[PDB]
Design a protein around this ligand. Structure first.
Ligand code: HEM
Ligand code: HEM
Ligand code: HEM
Ligand code: HEM
Ligand SMILES: [Xe]
Ligand SMILES: [Xe]
Ligand SMILES: [Xe]
Ligand SMILES: [Xe]
Ligand SMILES: [Xe]
Ligand SMILES: [Xe]
Ligand SMILES: [Xe]
Ligand SMILES: [Xe]
Ligand SMILES: [Xe]
Ligand SMILES: [Xe]
Lengths: 141, 146, 141, 146
C-alpha cells in the first residue's frame, strides 16, 4: 500500500517536476530502450532515434498519466481505468517491462531532483511506480 | 557446462517418451490460456476466445508442433544452445518482435505440461534438469536481441 | 482479480487434493530447492535432503495456509495477515521467490491431478497463487 | 551484455570521479531504506528504526565501504568478472546465505545513486553501460551458488 507519507512525498517531488513532465517521460523511455533493448520489441513501428517526435509525444502521454495518478493517488484504479483496459486488452505488454520502465523513471527523477531525491522520497517514488504498474496490469487476466 | 551427467540422461530419457507434435500443441495452447496477453503474437490464428477454442485451434496446434520441433532439435546440442538458436534468436528479435520474456513463460508452461502428462515419473530431480534446459533455451533465443 | 470461475476452479482442485495437501506442500518445497537452488538461502538451519522431516513439517504448514486461503478466498488479506506480518517483518524472503514456489506448487498439482489440471484450472490456480503471493508480500514496505 | 570499448571508457571515466566510501555508504543505506527486507542480514548493526537512522548508522556505512570497495576493484576485471568474484560468490552462498536477488537490488540502488550524484552527466548511454556492469557483477556473485 502507499502510506499517507508516501502520498505526501510523491505529490511534493512530482509537483517539482512540473512543466518538465514531458521531457522527463521521453528521457525515461530513451533510458529504457538503451538499457533494456528487449523493451524495443513493443515499439517496432516507432522512430526511436534520439529526440524523435514519437518518443517525445509518448513521453508526454506517459508523464500526463503519471500526473493524473499522483492527483488521484487515493483512487488510482478508477483514474487509470481506460489505461488499464488498453494495456490489458490491446497493447498486452508483458508485466515484466513495467519494472524496467519504473526503474528508468526513477533514475530520470534522481538525475533531475538533486534536492528532493532523499532516501525516503526514493522509497516512496519506487512504491508509487510499483503501485501504478500493478493498476496498469490488473486486468491482464 | 550446466547440466550434470545424471541431468542430461534424465532429459534424454524423458524426451524419448514425448510426442513432440502433441506436447507442442498442448504447451502453446496453455501459454495462450494461462497468460492470454501472449495472444498478441497470434492475431491471424483464428478463434482464441475460450480455453476450448484455443486448445482445439488447428493453427495453434500446427505452430505448437513447429516450436517444440525446434526445441526438440536443440536438445541434441545442450552444450551449444547459443549457437544452435542464434538464427531463430535474430528472427524473433528483428522480424517477429517477440519479447524474450515469452520464452520464459513458455518454459513454465512446458514444465507444467510435462508434469501433467507424466505425473510421478516427472520427479523433482527430472524437473530440476528440465528447468536448466528451459532457462538455457530461453537464454539462447534471447541472446541476439539488440 | 479472481473471478467466480477462478474461485470455483481453485476449490474444485484443492478439494481433490484433500488430505494429501501436506504431502504436496513438502513435494513443492523439494521441487523448489532442487530447481532453484538460491531459495535454499532461506533455510540454512534445515536438513533439505529428500524425505526430511523439517521439509515435511514446513510443507504441511504451507499447505494448511493455502487451505485457509482457499476457505477465505473473498477475505484473503485478513486470513493471511499474521503470515504477511511474519514474512514482511521477520523472515524477509525476497518477493521474487514467491513466484518460484508458486510455480513448483503448480507443477506438484499438475503431477497429481491428471483429470483436474485442465488449461482453465491451470490458469485459475496460477492466478490464485499470484494473489496469495501478493497478499504475503503486501506489508514488505 | 558485452561492453563496447566506448562503454568501458565511459564506465572508467565516471568511476574515477566517485568517492567510493561515500557512494558505498549511501548505496547500502538506500538498499536498507527502499527495500527494507534486506535489513534481515544486519540485525547486529544497531539502530535502523528510521531512514535517517539507517543512513547515519556507522556499521551500515562501514559495510557499504567494504562492499563498494570490492565492487570498485572488480571494475579492473570487466573481462573476467566470474573469476574475480568466484570466492566471494562461494562465501555469500555457503556462509552468508545471501539471496542473489539482493545483488540485483543493490545494482538498482547503485544506478539511482550515480544518477543522483552525477545528474545530467549520467546520460542514457552511460546508464546503459552501468546497467551492463551491475548485471555482470550480480551474475558473477551468483555464479557459484548451488
Ligand atoms: C508507468 C507505466 C506506464 C504508463 C503510465 C503508460 C502509459 C501509457 C499511455 C498514456 C499511453 C497512450 C495511450 C493513449 O494513446 O491513449 C500508452 C501507450 C503505449 N504503451 Fe504504456 N505505459 C506504461 C508502461 C508501458 C511499458 C512498460 C511498455 C513497454 C515496454 C509500454 C508500451 C506502450 C506502447 C507500445 C503504447 C502505444 C504507443 C503508440 O503506438 O502510440 N507501456 N502507455
Ligand atoms: C522454445 C521456444 C521457441 C522456439 C524454438 C521457436 C521457434 C520458432 C520457429 C521454428 C518458427 C517458424 C515456424 C515455421 O517454420 O513456420 C517460429 C515462429 C514464430 N514464433 Fe517462435 N519459437 C519459440 C517460442 C515462441 C513464443 C513463446 C512466442 C510468442 C508467445 C513465439 C512467437 C512466434 C511467432 C509470432 C512466429 C511467427 C508465426 C507466424 O507465422 O505467424 N515463439 N518460432
Ligand atoms: C505460497 C507461498 C507461501 C506460503 C503459503 C508460506 C507459508 C508459510 C507458513 C504457514 C509458515 C509457518 C509459519 C508458522 O506457523 O510458524 C512459513 C514459514 C517460513 N517460510 Fe513461508 N510461505 C510461502 C512462501 C515462502 C517462500 C517463497 C520462501 C523462501 C523461498 C519461504 C520461506 C519460509 C521460511 C524460511 C519460514 C520459516 C521456516 C522455519 O524456520 O520453520 N516462504 N511460511
Ligand atoms: C556489489 C556487490 C557486493 C560485493 C562486491 C560484496 C562484497 C563483500 C565483501 C568483500 C565482504 C567481506 C567478506 C570477508 O569477510 O572476507 C562481504 C561480506 C558480507 N556481505 Fe557482501 N557484497 C555485495 C553485496 C551484498 C548484499 C547486497 C548483501 C545483503 C543485502 C550482502 C551481505 C553481506 C554480509 C551480511 C556480509 C558479512 C559482513 C560481516 O560479517 O560484517 N552483500 N561482502
Ligand atoms: Xe516522468
Ligand atoms: Xe515511442
Ligand atoms: Xe511519479
Ligand atoms: Xe510449444
Ligand atoms: Xe523454452
Ligand atoms: Xe491452491
Ligand atoms: Xe501443492
Ligand atoms: Xe522447508
Ligand atoms: Xe557510453
Ligand atoms: Xe551489483
Amino acid at each position: 500500500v502507499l502510506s499517507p507519507a508516501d502520498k505526501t512525498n510523491v505529490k511534493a517531488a512530482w509537483g517539482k517536476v512540473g512543466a518538465h513532465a514531458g521531457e522527463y517521460g521521453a528521457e525515461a523511455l530513451e533510458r529504457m530502450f538503451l538499457s533494456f533493448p528487449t523493451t524495443k520489441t513493443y515499439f517496432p513501428h516507432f522512430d526511436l532515434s534520439h529526440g524523435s517526435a514519437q518518443v517525445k509525444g509518448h513521453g508526454k502521454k506517459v508523464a500526463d498519466a503519471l500526473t493524473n495518478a499522483v492527483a488521484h493517488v487515493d483512487d488510482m484504479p478508477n483514474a487509470l481505468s481506460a489505461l488499464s483496459d488498453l494495456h490489458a486488452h490491446k497493447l498486452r505488454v508483458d508485466p515484466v517491462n513495467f519494472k524496467l520502465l519504473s526503474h528508468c523513471l526513477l533514475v530520470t527523477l534522481a538525475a533531475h531532483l538533486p534536492a528532493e531525491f532523499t532516501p525516503a522520497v526514493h522509497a516512496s517514488l519506487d512504491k508509487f511506480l510499483a503501485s501504478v504498474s500493478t493498476v496498469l496490469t490488473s486486468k491482464y487476466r | 557446462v550446466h547440466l550434470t551427467p545424471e541431468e542430461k540422461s534424465a532429459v534424454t530419457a524423458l524426451w524419448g517418451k514425448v510426442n513432440v507434435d502433441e506436447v507442442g500443441g498442448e504447451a502453446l495452447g496453455r501459454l495462450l490460456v494461462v497468460y492470454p496477453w501472449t495472444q498478441r503474437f497470434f492475431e491471424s490464428f483464428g478463434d482464441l476466445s475460450t480455453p476450448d477454442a484455443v486448445m482445439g485451434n488447428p493453427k495453434v496446434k500446427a505452430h505448437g508442433k513447429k516450436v517444440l520441433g525446434a526445441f526438440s532439435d536443440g536438445l541434441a546440442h545442450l552444450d551449444n544452445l547459443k549457437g544452435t538458436f542464434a538464427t531463430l534468436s535474430e528472427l524473433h528479435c528483428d522480424k517477429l518482435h517477440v519479447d524474450p520474456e515469452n520464452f520464459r513463460l513458455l518454459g513454465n508452461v512446458l514444465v507444467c505440461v510435462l508434469a501433467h502428462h507424466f505425473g510421478k515419473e516427472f520427479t523433482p530431480p527430472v524437473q530440476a534438469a528440465y528447468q536448466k534446459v528451459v532457462a538455457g533455451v530461453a537464454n539462447a533465443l534471447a541472446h541476439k536481441y539488440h
